[PDB]
From a paper:
In doing so, HS augments interactions of [name] and FGFRP from the [name]–FGFRP–α[name] ternary complex with the FGFRS chain, and thus induces receptor (that is, FGFRP–FGFRS) dimerization.
The direct FGFRP–FGFRS contacts bury a modest solvent-exposed surface area (1542.6 Å2) and are preserved among the three cryo-EM structures. Akin to the FGFRP–FGFRS interface, the [name]–FGFRS interface is also conserved among the three quaternary complexes and masks a rather modest surface exposed area (1668.6 Å2). Specifically, we reasoned that a primary FGFR1cP should be able to pair with FGFR3c or [name] as the secondary receptor to yield functional 1:2:1:1 [name]–FGFR1c–FGFR3c–α[name]–HS or [name]–FGFR1c–[name]–αKloth–HS heterodimeric quaternary complexes. In contrast, copious and intense punctate fluorescent spots appeared on the surface of L6-FGFR1cΔPLBS + [name]ΔSLBS co-expressing cells, which implies that an [name]–FGFR1c–[name]–α[name]–HS heterodimeric quaternary complex can form on the surface of live cells.
Residue numbers in the entry:
A (entry chain E): 142 to 308, 315 to 351
B (entry chain C): 142 to 354
C (entry chain A): 34 to 97, 119 to 975
D (entry chain B): 25 to 203
The structure:
Amino acid sequence: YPQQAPYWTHPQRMEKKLHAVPAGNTVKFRCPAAGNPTPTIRWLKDGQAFHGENRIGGIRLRHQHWSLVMESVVPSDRGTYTCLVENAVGSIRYNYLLDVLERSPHRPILQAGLPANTTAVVGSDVELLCKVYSDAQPHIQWLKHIVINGSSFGADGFPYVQVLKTAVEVLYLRNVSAEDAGEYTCLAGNSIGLSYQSAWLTVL
Amino acid sequence: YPQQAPYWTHPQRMEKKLHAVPAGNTVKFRCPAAGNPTPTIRWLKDGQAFHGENRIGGIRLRHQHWSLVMESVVPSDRGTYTCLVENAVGSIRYNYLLDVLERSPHRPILQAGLPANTTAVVGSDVELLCKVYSDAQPHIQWLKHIVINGSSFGADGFPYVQVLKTADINSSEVEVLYLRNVSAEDAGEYTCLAGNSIGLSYQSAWLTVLPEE
Amino acid sequence: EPGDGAQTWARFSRPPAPEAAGLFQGTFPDGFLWAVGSAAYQTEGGWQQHGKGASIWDTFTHHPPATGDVASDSYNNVFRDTEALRELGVTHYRFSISWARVLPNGSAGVPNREGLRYYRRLLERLRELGVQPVVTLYHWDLPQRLQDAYGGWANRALADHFRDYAELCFRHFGGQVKYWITIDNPYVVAWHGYATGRLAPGIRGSPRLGYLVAHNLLLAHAKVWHLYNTSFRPTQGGQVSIALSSHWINPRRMTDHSIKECQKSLDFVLGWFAKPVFIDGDYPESMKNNLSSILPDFTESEKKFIKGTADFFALCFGPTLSFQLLDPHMKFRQLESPNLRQLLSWIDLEFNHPQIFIVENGWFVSGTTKRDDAKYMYYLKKFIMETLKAIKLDGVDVIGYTAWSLMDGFEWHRGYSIRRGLFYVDFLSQDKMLLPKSSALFYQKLIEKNGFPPLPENQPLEGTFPCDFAWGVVDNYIQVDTTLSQFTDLNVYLWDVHHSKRLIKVDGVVTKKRKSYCVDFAAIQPQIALLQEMHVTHFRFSLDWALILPLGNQSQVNHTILQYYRCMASELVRVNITPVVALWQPMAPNQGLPRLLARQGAWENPYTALAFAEYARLCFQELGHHVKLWITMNEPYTRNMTYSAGHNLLKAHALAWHVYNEKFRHAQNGKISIALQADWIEPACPFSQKDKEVAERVLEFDIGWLAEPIFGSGDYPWVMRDWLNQRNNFLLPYFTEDEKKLIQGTFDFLALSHYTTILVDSEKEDPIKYNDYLEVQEMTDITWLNSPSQVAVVPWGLRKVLNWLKFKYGDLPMYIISNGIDDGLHAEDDQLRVYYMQNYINEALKAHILDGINLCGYFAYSFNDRTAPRFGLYRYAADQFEPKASMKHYRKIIDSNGFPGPETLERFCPEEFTVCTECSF
Amino acid sequence: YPNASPLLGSSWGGLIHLYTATARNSYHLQIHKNGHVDGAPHQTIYSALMIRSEDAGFVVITGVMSRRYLCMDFRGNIFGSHYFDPENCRFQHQTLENGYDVYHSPQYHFLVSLGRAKRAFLPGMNPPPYSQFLSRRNEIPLIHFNTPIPRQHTQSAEDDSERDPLNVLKPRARMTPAP
Ligand SMILES: O=C(O)[C@@H]1O[C@@H](O)[C@H](OS(=O)(=O)O)[C@@H](O)C1O[C@H]1O[C@H](COS(=O)(=O)O)[C@@H](O[C@@H]2O[C@@H](C(=O)O)[C@@H](O[C@H]3O[C@H](COS(=O)(=O)O)[C@H](O[C@@H]4O[C@@H](C(=O)O)[C@H](O[C@H]5O[C@H](COS(=O)(=O)O)[C@@H](O[C@@H]6O[C@@H](C(=O)O)[C@H](O[C@H]7O[C@H](COS(=O)(=O)O)[C@@H](O[C@@H]8O[C@@H](C(=O)O)[C@@H](O[C@H]9O[C@H](COS(=O)(=O)O)[C@@H](O)[C@H](O)[C@H]9NS(=O)(=O)O)[C@H](O)[C@H]8OS(=O)(=O)O)[C@H](O)[C@H]7NS(=O)(=O)O)[C@H](O)[C@H]6OS(=O)(=O)O)[C@H](O)[C@H]5NS(=O)(=O)O)[C@H](O)[C@H]4OS(=O)(=O)O)[C@H](O)[C@H]3NS(=O)(=O)O)[C@H](O)[C@H]2OS(=O)(=O)O)[C@H](O)[C@H]1NS(=O)(=O)O
Ligand SMILES: [Cu+2]
Ligand SMILES: [Zn+2]
């Protein structure tokens, strides 16, 4: 019966040192430092005691591998994750980092009415606007419809790609006249989904 | 080894009939079972075989633990599922309803151009509308600016505001204001002020009365 | 196979669609056996004539009053019986042979030559007329020689005596008879003959005897059946069955236990005899289990002896078993119903689709009933309809129908206290001639038409209503709420336009109230939005007298209430929906009056008519600028109001009309009249003169009471005065010349409200449900559609009452001020309302075009389900108004302006001059 | 490229069901006539709620079947009342940063939860279970909201001697004056 100076179970499987989990993605951190007799394991963040009551959503402490789980991770969980397991003699310290990227719970919506109705001639070009409310810069497209058989309201999909700029955003419809008509869209989208808006856009 | 019929290993963790999470969450679809021996579990969505080919973005494979993980659930994931694992002597299955919802933690966004700079002849019927968009319950109020004493500004640069229409328990069509037989006094800056637990946003429009046309 | 029919309640649990089942009007299949029934103790009579024996009935009635010694005297009257059959149009005569008549002394003796002579004369007469016979060997009249010697049917030695008697019947009357019924109603013969004692043999032994006797009846019937099959059928080709009477039973609470319990009851009363004869030869397992000991067992040879001993299914569904002679314990605590369509489906499923021949049907009337039996005719009409529905909609193979009791006669235990005859017999008379009843004329016409062929009077009419037609809806109790939802806040607030977007109230400076317009009412606009969707042209609503003038007098007026009504009328005109305003409405806790006015007599004091004139004057002044159609009384309760109350009500209407005519009509070119509830009244028997007179008299008391002074002669109806004067009831006030001229012409149009029609019968079947005041017996045709509130759907009543009003009161502009039906359920009965709306409007279209009636408006009853529950065209659930299916179909009628054909169009009509609306005066 | 464009923000007064989860089972907030508040496992007509906002962030929950208003008391339990008050029968709605809605009385500092753990509310801590609500649009057809209660049972004049079972005779309620 020697003393207790043990190691973990899976060396390569445990330590990753980096977790760029998107917001709302469940993740858990494990510190299975086994031994004989079984030591005690404590988890703390930013140098302060960590419980299941000081964090939104809720964490669960398992005992099969002695790990805590984070269902519906949130941006407020940024900082450092240090797990400290101490045996009868000595102690083992591990570190973990977490920088959760922002992921909105909705597809990027935009102010209604926009894009405004296109009614102009040469001299005063159309300034089409569409402002999108999002944390980061989302994917915004225009998707001008190709005029085949009056394709403005149909079915079976209408893929008409038209790319000018993606990134409040404005468009300069230079030299507006009676050659480009139809319905215009503001294809605002992100990982969650894509959205577009339109109105009674009728031009000469 | 007896050839007993398959049964739920942990029946106490199967009562969540319906799953509903914000778009972006990860749902857990776990159903331990048995068999002679425990057979493979093949999830299928509303009849069509469900696996990692109809949705790119991450589907964790957990067969030894008999569970399904749906990472980054998106609006296009609604539909009841099935824990369909087929045994030689038994056929058990439990539906797993999932209903993802799209949130909007934002101040009420009003439709741009509503209310608009609409002008009406004296004695006509004008109508001002403000289309508001907010999943959380908004409070719609219609405001008119006054010139009570001097200019339209108050003690500390606050424009004077009188409330015309409110959103009470039994008041509908709050986002529409009716002004029939508009006089000279029925002209100014009408702002539809909408707000919820996140914030308040107002859209202002000007109504001008034309005595002649 | 047994248990197959347990699904019958499942198919009939769902109500049928009131479109195919509404105007069903089918035709019976060719080769149908239209039959009429008779017995040998009910009608034959002559209990000792020509050496006749003694039945168990001849000893039951005398019990050694109300005896069948000479009941209908049919034994001596063969010519008058067959003459009734010839004029009835019937093709089969179901009668029975008296066992004690043909074989008085003994079965193995000398047959009664005179007794046999009567039946061969009867069959010779039946042959000449072409009426085929349906002979019943045994109709509950067993010879007394077989009751005091062998003990009756309790002995198994009567099978040989029945077989020897049946052979005599088969041998003699075999070349003409091809339909035989061995024993009629074996349940009543067994259960009530020996197990209860209420029938011909007085025993009351035990249920053991009833199941022992029924054991012998099946053996006796199967002994006779195999006598026909092996000896007479090859050379005669006839058919033999057993008349199995039954009931219909319904579940108590609609559970699987009740359904099994219901099937348990049917097997106890119907499968008791049908299964041993039609399926296998043994009793149903339901009755073989519980009473296994008291019920006798069947030998294996016997079971295959009775299997298939019936060439057709003979059903006796009438007042014998249903509700009269069914043992209460046989019901197993369930609900008994007289449903024949469901029973025929039960027979079809359970007994391997047999050819059902109904050998007894119909109902009964009271004993004191002469040739006018309207209750029995409509039971026959429903019962005949039920078989037609079973034939067409259920696929049942019904091959014949038998209306029981060709003539009145001794009705078994009930004696002469009831009458089931199609032909009236005067029992006290010494001749006893068959006088056709109302059902006799009905049955004869049904046989001639072979069912219910479609009638031209009910075929939908393709046509368009005239231009400027008043397509409208009504809402008697509009929801009034003077809630100022707009510009109601007067204070001046600050605004953190940049900081917090909140309001800081400034205390000290407030503005003045803006001019209150009609958009400040939060409930007016939602209601107009619904009406705009209905595409209605008119909207009808009634004002609240108790709200405009809470204390009755004009000293205080609720101007806020008037502003709501004026705003509602002004907004309706703005959206091109003409308002129709009713000044007074009887439907209120205080009869529609203010509490102060309702305390004295509430209509008795003539001051009430005076106080209404001023209230009407106030309404015309405020609301009148926008309202151009006025209704003074809104369907007053002509059946619930006193003569003095109706006297002042007529004066009150005249004062209001004379207020409008003299003061307001010039300034506001509007119209004003009275709305009366015009529900049609139809005679029960279409060919009865005394029923027509009663129908007209009831119409005078209902419609003509408040319409003759106004639309007619200016005085109360002549029939109403005659009825009360000869009754020594002088409670109808007389009209003075000044009053007569005051109310003589106080009308601008005829506003009528039609909902349903009522059948009236002069004769009193029962005094409990008899209106002794008017000497009327109100009834209904059960073949009509019914709402969950039991209101008959009678489309042709609207056309009939319109023509009556035109005939009685000249060619007036007629408005259908209210016409709609209710739906108790949510969506299972709204398909009835669209059927109700479509046909009633079509019948109104028929009256307009075919009769030239100056109809200038249709107003569907009720605007929404909130104000008027169960009647609305808009469903009010969870504080939300949702259109019903009736609304969408009503809008299609409104848009098309009637029912245009396949290719027909009327051009736009500018300034059309039908005299019902406001012209240039 | 398929086009769907589902508008966001339509819940400005429509019928909603409050959904909460705890990783064990789901429950919908439900209000009964007797004031009892519990959790329906699925969507019920009883659980149909109509949230209405009076101030910029304060909402009141009613429910369209019980015709009651969701109120609250000092202990933290919730119930339904037929009468409206602005003191405790009104809760400040707050959307958490994870997308879940929590309702708490502004002056009682206790979150509305379907469980019995009535704890205080603080910005950014693990809320009590059954409290992170999630509004769900009402997919129940509104036809079911009508009350089917007018059921009739006939016991009088029900015996073994009925003469008019199909009810041909239907007398009308007419008054007969007598001098
Ligand atoms: O007091 C107070 O306050 C109050 O008072 C008053 O008022 C009242 O009263 S009255 O009357 O009035 O009412 C009261 O009541 C009260 O209260 C209140 O409040 C409260 C609260 O308070 S506060 O404070 O909060 O406020 C509340 O409450 C609550 O509740 C309660 C109850 O419930 O009761 C409680 O609690 C307690 O208790 C309980 C009990 O319950 S009962 O029923 O009993 O009653 C519980 O419990 C207990 O305990 C527990 C423990 O343990 O703790 C248990 O359990 C739990 O948990 C568990 C776990 O397990 S263990 O073992 O861990 O433990 C569970 O589970 C299970 O299992 C698991 C396992 O298996 O493990 C699973 O799993 C999972 O996870 C895992 C992990 O993960 S990680 O991340 O971590 O790792 C996994 O895994 C995975 O996978 C794997 C595989 O795949 O295999 C992996 O991987 C691997 O490999 C791989 C490969 O690659 S690939 O390619 O393939 O992929 C690799 O790569 C890698 O690397 C590797 N890895 S490693 O790791 O391996 O290395 C992976 O990785 C992993 O991961 S992941 O990420 O992915 O995941 C698995 O898989 C998973 N799954 S999934 O699929 O999903 O994911 C699961 O979980 C399960 O399964 S099964 O099948 O089995 O099912 C369970 O479930 C739980 N429970 S349950 O319920 O749920 O059941 C035990 O058992 C129990 O006992 S019994 O008897 O029951 O059984 C609980 O828990 C407790 N608590 S604690 O703390 O302790 O927790 C309390 O109170 C609360 O709660 S809490 O929680 O919060 O606390 C109430 O309610 C109220 N009330 S009122 O009224 O108001 O309402
Ligand atoms: Cu966002
Ligand atoms: Zn009659």
